């Protein structure tokens, strides 16, 4: 399959996915009601754009991507269904892109967004220009380059999304495990917990699970994770720890302890222990990746918030 | 992570996996009670072999693979558990090999074995010398070359195996969906059915699902497969069908119909409609792959049984 | 080989090469008399910096890189020769970077520099953020990202350079063949011609040769190029031509004709037929690579000089 | 460019090149006067075969490959020349195959053939089933598998061949440098010598040169080789040496000394010091590639002659 066709390609969650697919070398077409700078950018990069939803727009596509739900009223969708051309939802296509890159999946019911941003800021500090996903939208610091150009794709993994268990990361973070989204799992928190174990098991045997042992549910499932693991937190027995947490004005300073390294002092612009933990997750990922102390410090301290 | 240690590396389903990991460039070590020609061949290909079990044999391992359960009486396994070295069961490591190759997963409650063998036979006749997994044992035809050398890895996928949902194939077959293994899904055939759907959704959007629509359960779940699909069977509405089934001795002849090709006359050396169907499934994969008609005929005809 | 040691890593032509090698995943170290922002950037990206020259700085290195400004008395190079560690000049290391990337070699005695710049500008318009080499110095637009990140390396190819015939490009341009550098080839123009033929034969059989047939010597060697070729110029028999050249201020307008395409009005911010020709070479490369007409029009016109 | 057409595809040096290109994923067509089992095998592997020569046979080809000189009279060759479609000689396409594989180029005026066979034998014993090239004909041990399937391509490199300096190997061997082919270089041994330096300089900085220092001309040019180099010979200063040479029947025994290894006893089934040296060269390559002593001992011992 080589031509992907987006119904509503100008839609916020959609344009960024089409751009990555263009970066990977696929043929991309798309349809939208209105033309905008977002459609002209995609066009400049090689997408075929159609204005209006006529059934013929889907002609030649090997797969369709739709924004919300499968709408057989849309003649583009209906025509593909009538010819058994697969129609995948936006969220699954988003998840697939990680199969083409060194994917860092940031799970956890709270702390996903800030941790993704801190990772991205630190990797950018190291010159790696990562593409990252927050709230379903793809981004990168560099604005003229195409999304997906980096070797790295950093994304939050929502355990209430139907593609959670289809992520294929190289590294996976679990900041915490909360019962917010029990309803996705038959309102049973034990099923939700088992899903996190399954998620962590989609890592390869050479992957890396990065786990907040300060969360007692994370600490409970740790022995079940048959993958390389690095723990972090304030806990005395965590692999990577923060001590001497202090404040200078509106900024938080602390010392990070890591295996086989000297203690490293660090600061971040945001308050609260949770942002200290989000920095530790970030420091774990960057350390394992080979990023320098200078880039870690620079990325953590420059993140606005 | 780059050195894998096998507890019982000489075992029947272990040595093949060690050999493929050697072929992929990893460092492989293992232990066994008895020195063997199996362990000698592994040593010739670069594995480090220890005779007898001693906790030091696991030193420097990034991961251990064990033959079944975690017999934590074994010193190596216990030394790994203490040092937080993941201990991965045999079948998980076997399933993960497909991420390194063009994987073909042969699923279906019955027909898995013959279909996998037929596929290997046709690809072999096409010069592709695939590695294939039957009954948990890795094989190939040319026997001096390491397992894994082929671009292709053809494996049976058992839905009662805990690794079923962790296979990452490029092409998936479903020969039939029977209720033999309802116990694995809490004695619920509907749970079983949904797992075959989840299985097929591990295909990427450019993968291929090959479905026997002669099976009514496979026909029921077909509309939920949001992946490229080719159907086969004797049903008049199948994409790839067999017609004019005849016999001459212990060999079955029939004509295969394919979209956009001329009718092809084929024989196979095995009786019954089910082997006609396993041949249809093979003809589908081979055709998608680009293998010549000549290799298809020779692959199917020369297979003994 | 995995550790490259630059003697004078902060020098003007050395720092870019080291940064690319870092982007390729090599271990990079380097010495210099003075720490600078250049040495800080490389350090932040993972290079080990030594200040001051001393024999042990080269310890562990698999290869040394030296520029013209390095004496044989330099202790680091002296120690390397004593241990049979290879010492390669900066220009050769520079020419071998194309082996990792899709290399576009911009050759031809006059116009190398503008044509390289035009290619980079057009490719950037399509969001490809290429790294490019002008006067031996590596650059890219995205300032925070590491040199070498793009799939594309566009480089001046200089026939007076000893490494001319070790370039391994995927596409090669010859703007013109002049006698300026006869002295590199025994002071014999015909040997210089033969050198250009051998240069183009470094292309793979699937590569592209882009030849200005307005140059009589380029036209003369054309039947010796056993590679795929697209010709450009004002000559009516060129594959890609400019017609209806006109002016509107400091801007030059013309129509470009391409096989199997509609005519495209184009404008560049530089005078003279030579800059029309440099634009045709750019358009040929861009068209072949798949870049949109909009990116071609925008890259060409937005270039200053 | 994606379709290669072979004029005289059944020929002795042509069919193997076509087969490797098939294994590389290219479209291959070919013409011949008589159908053969050779053309049938290639047809089974994907090649379109044409019996008899006709100008249409070259329709759609991006490059042609010819058996000797550019026949001009041949209708397919003439058709291609009229469309400016490149026509490469057999030897040039054969040398291009190395850019796709881990290429080991065995050069030297004498000993090329035995040394290539010894390398193939050792690699095969290590389970790597190399494709190797002797007398312009490609071969491999396993016979149903397509040529080119191995990661390794081992080829003799002849300095009287027009493509000698177009090889792109990973490892280069120089067994010795004689004046046999002075005529190729204007009857001047000093130019011939310089060609061997330039040949070795087509290695990347991560390549490896393997040099017999028992040859005084090899020893003379050694300091000019700015690539990683391992020396071998009987000379007391060679990096890898043979000592304790003795006989036991038609079998030569000797001990091999290697940097940072224990001495290894080996035997070969051929007489003479020159086959001790060709064995030494084979041992350098195998050692650097990581092949075990068992495979070295077995490959060398089991080679007939």
Curated annotation (Swiss-Prot), chains A, B, C, D:
Signal peptide coordinates: none
Binding site for ATP: 108-114
A single GO BP: cell division
Domain of life: Bacteria
Reactions it catalyzes: UDP-N-acetyl-alpha-D-muramate + L-alanine + ATP = UDP-N-acetyl-alpha-D-muramoyl-L-alanine + ADP + phosphate + H(+)
Example of a GO MF term: UDP-N-acetylmuramate-L-alanine ligase activity
Pathway: Cell wall biogenesis; peptidoglycan biosynthesis
Main location: cytoplasm
Subcellular locations according to the entry: Cytoplasm
Keywords, comma-separated and alphabetical: ATP-binding, Cell cycle, Cell division, Cell shape, Cell wall biogenesis/degradation, Cytoplasm, Ligase, Nucleotide-binding, Peptidoglycan synthesis
EC number: 6.3.2.8
A GO CC term attached to the entry: cytoplasm
Similarity comment: family membership: Belongs to the MurCDEF family.
Role: Cell wall formation.
Name listed for the protein in its UniProt record: UDP-N-acetylmuramate--L-alanine ligase
Gene symbol of the encoding locus: murC
Covered residues, full protein: 16 to 319 of 480
């Amino acid at each position: 399959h080589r031509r992907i066709h987006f119904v509503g390609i100008g839609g916020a969650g959609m344009c960024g996915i089409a751009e990555v697919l263009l970066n990977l070398g696929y043929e991309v077409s798309g349809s939208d009601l209105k033309a905008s700078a977002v459609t002209e950018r995609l066009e400049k990069f090689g997408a075929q754009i159609f204005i209006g939803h006529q059934a013929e727009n889907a002609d030649g596509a090997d797969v369709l991507v739709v924004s919300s739900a499968i709408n057989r009223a849309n003649p583009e969708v209906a025509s593909a269904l009538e010819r058994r051309i697969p129609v995948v939802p936006r969220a699954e296509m988003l998840a697939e892109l990680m199969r083409y890159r060194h994917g860092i999946a940031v799970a956890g019911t709270h702390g996903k967004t800030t941790t993704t941003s801190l990772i991205a800021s630190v990797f950018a500090a190291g010159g790696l220009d990562p593409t990252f996903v927050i709230g379903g939208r793809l981004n990168a610091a560099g604005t003229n380059a195409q999304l997906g150009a980096s070797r790295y794709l950093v994304a939050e993994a929502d355990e209430s999304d139907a593609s959670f268990l289809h992520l294929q990361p190289m590294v996976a973070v679990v900041t915490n495990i909360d019962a917010d989204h029990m309803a996705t799992y038959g309102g049973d928190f034990n099923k939700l917990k088992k899903t996190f174990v399954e998620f962590l098991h989609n890592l390869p045997f050479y992957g890396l699970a990065v786990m907040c042992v300060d969360d007692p549910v994370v600490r409970e499932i740790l022995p079940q994770i048959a993958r390389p693991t690095v723990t972090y937190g304030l806990s005395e027995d965590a692999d990577v720890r923060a001590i001497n947490i202090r404040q200078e004005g509106m900024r938080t300073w602390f010392t990070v302890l890591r295996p086989e390294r000297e203690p490293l002092d660090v600061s971040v612009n945001m308050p609260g222990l949770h942002n200290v933990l989000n920095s530790l997750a970030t420091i774990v990922i960057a350390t394992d990746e080979g990023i320098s102390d200078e880039a870690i410090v620079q990325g953590l301290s420059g993140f606005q918030g």
